[PDB]
């Protein structure tokens, strides 16, 4: 039974902008804000701005650079090796490199 407590301490600039996880709003009413942030509600009642667990999970599993012998870029571990920057699958179903 193994568990780790991991803490980052960032020397912040004066009123520096923080970039947490954003909640989706395609269904938008113009009363309340469209672009929101993912929040962890504390016991006191206040809301701490936070990342999703899957967001953290996606970062740790950014290890896949086996899709070419000279590829330096690491993809998030996917069954088809999807690269959403350049917008192609690096392990297509046509090839022998996809998981299945």
């Amino acid at each position: 039974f193994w568990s780790a407590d991991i803490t980052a301490k960032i020397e912040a600039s004066f009123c520096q902008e923080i970039y947490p996880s954003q909640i989706l709003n395609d269904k938008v009413k113009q009363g309340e804000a469209s672009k929101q942030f993912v929040k962890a509600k504390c016991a006191d009642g206040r809301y701490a701005v936070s990342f999703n667990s899957v967001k953290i999970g996606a970062a740790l599993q950014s290890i896949d650079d086996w899709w070419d012998e000279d590829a330096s870029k690491r993809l998030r571990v996917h069954e088809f090796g999807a690269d959403k920057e350049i917008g192609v699958a690096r392990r297509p179903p046509d090839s022998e490199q996809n998981f299945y």
Partner: protein, 50 residues
Amino acid sequence: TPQFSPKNISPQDLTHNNILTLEECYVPPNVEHIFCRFSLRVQANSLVPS
């Protein structure tokens, strides 16, 4: 237009704005350090299919 031709709507409406209602997170003034903490558990689930 979809094939790059300018459609004719008012010259004054191009400099016109959109109202955006956003949430913003900034560090409070004269706070030197910010902290981000998560916990990681590791289980041996890749040996046998569930």
